[PDB]
């Protein structure tokens, strides 16, 4: 075998009877998926990844932005000065997993190194023609409901030295987080985590951090600047746009409670992540509008070189894939 | 933090030679290294990026290599418009450059004295200047002397452009003293120190003479 | 065909504020990092920041988060650096510049703005005074006699200096100007003429310096005695 581009497909389990908008882009876009399916180890195999260059990556972005423009139609989008107005109903969205298969002539080979840092060598490869069930999750700062690490914190990132990449941290133990809007402003909501999971988890990820960088004090902070969208956690929540405040999660002096409460806010008009434009939707529906999720990855820049001997990071995103290369990165296509 | 050093800092060549310069980094960076030509008042150019990758449109004569700690930069039969400053840079870290001019022949300034003008001495200030034209190299010393007493510290020097056509750079040292210092001394002189004099040149006047 | 073009030159006191524009074209604006540089005068580069214009997610060099905001309008394509708290050694020129990588990080910087000067000063306008450097028939060096115009303590700059209403170009030094403690800057302008013509040809320096509307100009000949 060897690394190859190719045409890949999806599949899922879909229900074509649901109304939710995930369910329906699978049904026409994806295929069943093999009840019982196996992957071969392979003996005395080592092989090269580089999660940060893998055009499986590409090809589920180009899914997700076709399933969001099509599921999710804006009262009015802005694009350059062009603005289009057509019908917005509320739709129902739950993200369902999705998986990505090789086709004939091709296969998938997937790392099992329990710690594999996402580029190297992998000295324990399985081959595979899908990948694991991917539940798109669009969010900023926070990578919610997707698979934890299997052993312990890992830090990914293509080069240390590069203040502008991003930072993928991977936890294995999750920090839940619910965020409600409820039944009795609209546009008011907010979300819960506890305090001991944050700021235990936060510990573990500075602890992994020095590893990186030696003979430095590593100290987290708020976003520097930027939209709304990725200063605070932003994220979808049954099909209205929740933007939540952090400040409070990486304010050093912050870190007395039992669960730190965020402020949270429903916007109707969003900077599209998708493409270049803005977007207005309706008003949020009522009832109790609550997403109880799961925090399993961070995603964190580092401050331009100060010296202070200390390593300041900050919150960001922005990029969804990235979001896509936390799920992706123990995997690559060959061609047979 | 990466430190970029760039040699040789200064480096006359000719019309048609080949040059090379060298680009140092106290770390490894791989190929990730770029290089940028710079004239004054105008925007660096990107001539090579990732190490030996030519930019669109630039000539052929232009060639990068290198790796790791050490890259330079080949100019092939070099022409008047390669005349220019050179930045090495990788990530964030700029190199302080490579500059070319044009080599010559030695050529001794000639040197001047200007006495400050009775203009000036009414508003109370007096400025002495001593001009010295048409050398190469670019390295001199002027030194002032008021009545045999070694000045330092209240003169400022400045030099011109390599000229396009001859290659000799000039350069004005002006003394600047208060009226009444001025008018308290004099032999006013400027001694000049340069690889195409045989021994220093000086140049003085007495105040109030002519 | 990716064109950057920044916003003319400022001049500031200490403590002031500045807001330098960069205005993109003939490509894509949110795919490519932005990078802003400053070069101080006999400096080499200095970093000050980027942004990224997909969301203006930005970043800094050392100490320039304190001060810089970094902004930039989509529908428009064009980036905003502003600084506050302005310092004298904030003089120099600054950059914006665009990574040639398609979304991603190279910091290989293929297209550039002409650069902005930013002077940061406590000094006012002032016009210069111009005094001659007067040439002498007994002095001669390498054959030829030499005169001048000495143009003293102005700001901010520049000046331009021209001999004869441009009918004498040939062998004028029009030296940089040097910056003074006072914070005013001064120049000089020379030229080497034959000694033979000092009685008949008569030699005039034309001073402009447009901040202050101050035009001068001055005959230098030999003084008598
Ligand atoms: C990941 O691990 C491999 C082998 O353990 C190593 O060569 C590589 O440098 C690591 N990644 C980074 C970013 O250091
Ligand atoms: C290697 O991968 C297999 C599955 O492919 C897994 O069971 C095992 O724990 C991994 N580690 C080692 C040391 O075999
Ligand atoms: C998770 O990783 C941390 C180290 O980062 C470790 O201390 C902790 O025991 C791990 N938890 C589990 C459940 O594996
Ligand atoms: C979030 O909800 C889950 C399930 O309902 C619960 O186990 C967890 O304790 C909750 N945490 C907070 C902070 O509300
Ligand atoms: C961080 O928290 C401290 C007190 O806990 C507060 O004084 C400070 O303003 C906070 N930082 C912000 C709001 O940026
Ligand atoms: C979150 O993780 C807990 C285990 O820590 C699990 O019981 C729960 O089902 C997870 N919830 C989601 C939405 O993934
Ligand atoms: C995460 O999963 C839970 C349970 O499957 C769901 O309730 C929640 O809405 C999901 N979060 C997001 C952001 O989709
Ligand atoms: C690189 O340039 C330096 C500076 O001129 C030179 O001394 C050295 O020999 C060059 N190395 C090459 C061409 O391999």
Redesign the interface.
């Given at each position: 075998w060897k690394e190859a581009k190719t045409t890949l497909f999806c599949a899922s389990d879909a229900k074509a009877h649901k109304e939710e908008v995930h369910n329906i882009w699978a049904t026409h876009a994806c295929v069943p998926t093999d009840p019982n399916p196996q992957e071969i180890v392979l003996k005395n195999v080592t092989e090269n990844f580089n999660m940060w260059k893998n055009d499986m990556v590409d090809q589920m972005h180009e899914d997700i932005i076709s399933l969001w423009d099509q599921s999710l139609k804006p009262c009015v989008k802005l694009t350059?000065?062009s603005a289009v107005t057509q019908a917005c109903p509320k739709v129902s969205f739950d993200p369902i997993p999705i998986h990505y298969c090789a086709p004939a002539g091709y296969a998938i080979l997937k790392c099992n190194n329990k710690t594999f840092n996402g580029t190297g060598p992998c000295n324990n490869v399985s081959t595979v023609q899908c990948t694991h069930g991917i539940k798109p999750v669009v969010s900023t700062q926070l990578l919610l409901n997707g698979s934890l690490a299997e052993e312990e914190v890992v830090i990914r990132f293509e080069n240390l030295t590069?203040?502008?990449?991003i930072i993928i941290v991977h936890l294995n133990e999750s920090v839940e987080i619910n965020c409600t809007r409820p039944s009795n402003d609209i546009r008011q909501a907010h979300c819960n985590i506890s305090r001991k999971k944050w700021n235990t988890t936060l510990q573990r990820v500075k602890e992994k951090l020095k590893e990186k960088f030696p003979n430095k004090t590593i100290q987290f902070a708020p976003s520097?600047?930027?939209?709304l969208?990725?200063t605070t956690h932003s994220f979808n929540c049954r099909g209205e746009f929740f933007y939540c405040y952090t400040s409070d999660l990486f304010n050093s002096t912050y870190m007395g409670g039992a669960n730190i409460t965020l402020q949270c806010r429903i916007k109707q008009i969003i900077?599209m992540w998708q493409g270049?434009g803005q977007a207005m939707y309706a008003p949020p529906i009522a009832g109790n509008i609550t997403c109880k999720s799961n925090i399993t990855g961070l995603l964190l820049?580092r401050?331009?070189?100060?010296?202070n001997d200390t390593e300041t990071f900050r919150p960001?995103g922005?990029?969804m894939r990235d979001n896509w290369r936390s799920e992706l990165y123990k995997y690559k296509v060959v061609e047979i | 933090y990466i430190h970029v050093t760039q040699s040789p800092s200064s480096l006359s060549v000719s019309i048609g030679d080949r040059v090379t310069i060298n680009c140092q980094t106290s770390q490894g960076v791989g190929s990730?290294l770029?290089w940028?030509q710079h004239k004054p008042g105008?925007?660096?150019?990107?001539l090579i990026?990732?190490t030996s990758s030519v930019?669109d449109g630039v000539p052929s004569r232009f060639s990068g290599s290198g790796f790791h700690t050490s890259f330079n930069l080949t100019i092939s039969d070099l022409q008047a418009d390669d005349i220019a400053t050179y930045?090495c840079?990788?990530?964030?870290?700029?190199?302080?450059?490579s500059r070319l001019h044009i080599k010559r022949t030695v050529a001794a300034?000639?040197?001047?004295?200007?006495?400050?003008?009775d203009?000036?001495l009414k508003?109370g200030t007096a400025?002495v200047?001593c001009?010295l034209?048409?050398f190469y190299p670019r390295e001199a010393k002027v030194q002032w002397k008021v009545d045999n007493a070694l000045q330092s510290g209240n003169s400022?020097?400045?030099?011109?452009e390599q000229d396009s056509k001859d290659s000799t750079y000039?350069l004005?040292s002006?003394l600047?003293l208060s009226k009444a210092d001025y008018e308290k001394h004099k032999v006013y002189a400027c001694e000049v120190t340069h690889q195409g004099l045989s021994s220093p040149v000086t140049?003085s006047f007495n105040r109030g003479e002519? | 065909r990716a064109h950057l073009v920044q916003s003319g030159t400022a001049m500031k006191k200490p403590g002031a504020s500045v807001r330098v524009s960069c205005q993109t074209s003939g490509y894509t604006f949110?795919a490519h990092?932005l990078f802003w540089?400053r070069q101080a005068p006999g400096?080499?580069?200095?970093?000050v920041?980027?942004i990224?214009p997909?969301?203006?997610?930005?970043?800094?060099?050392?100490?320039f988060?304190d001060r810089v905001?970094?902004?930039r309008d989509?529908?428009r394509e064009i980036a905003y650096m502003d600084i506050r708290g302005l310092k004298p050694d904030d003089t120099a020129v600054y950059?914006c510049?665009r990574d040639?990588s398609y979304?991603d990080?190279?910091?290989?910087?293929?297209a550039?703005?002409?650069?902005t000067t930013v002077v940061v000063s406590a000094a006012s306008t002032k016009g210069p005074?111009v005094?001659?450097?007067?040439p002498s028939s007994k002095?001669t060096?390498?054959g030829?006699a030499?005169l001048?115009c000495?143009v003293?303590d102005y700001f901010p700059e520049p000046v331009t200096v021209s001999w004869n209403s441009g009918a004498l170009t040939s062998g004028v030094?029009?030296?940089?100007?040097?910056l003074?403690s006072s914070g005013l800057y001064?120049?000089?302008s020379?030229v080497?003429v034959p000694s033979s013509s000092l009685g008949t040809q008569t030699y005039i320096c034309n001073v402009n310096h447009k901040p202050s509307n101050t035009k001068v100009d001055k005959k230098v000949e030999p003084?008598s005695?």
């Open positions: 350059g000065g590069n203040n502008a990449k520097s600047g930027g939209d969208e990725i900077r270049v820049t401050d331009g070189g100060k010296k960001g922005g990029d | 990730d770029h940028y105008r925007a660096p150019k990107l990026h990732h930019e930045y840079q990788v990530l964030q870290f700029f190199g302080r450059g300034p000639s040197v001047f004295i200007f006495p400050p003008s203009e000036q508003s400025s200047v001009l034209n048409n400022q020097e400045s030099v011109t000039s004005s002006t600047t140049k002519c | 949110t990092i540089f400096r080499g580069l200095e970093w920041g980027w990224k997909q969301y203006g997610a930005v970043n800094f060099g050392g100490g988060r905001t970094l902004t989509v529908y950059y510049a040639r979304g990080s190279s910091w290989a910087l293929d550039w703005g002409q650069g005074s005094f001659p450097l007067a002095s060096s390498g030829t030499a001048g000495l003293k030094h029009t030296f940089p100007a040097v003074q001064s120049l000089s020379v080497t003084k005695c």
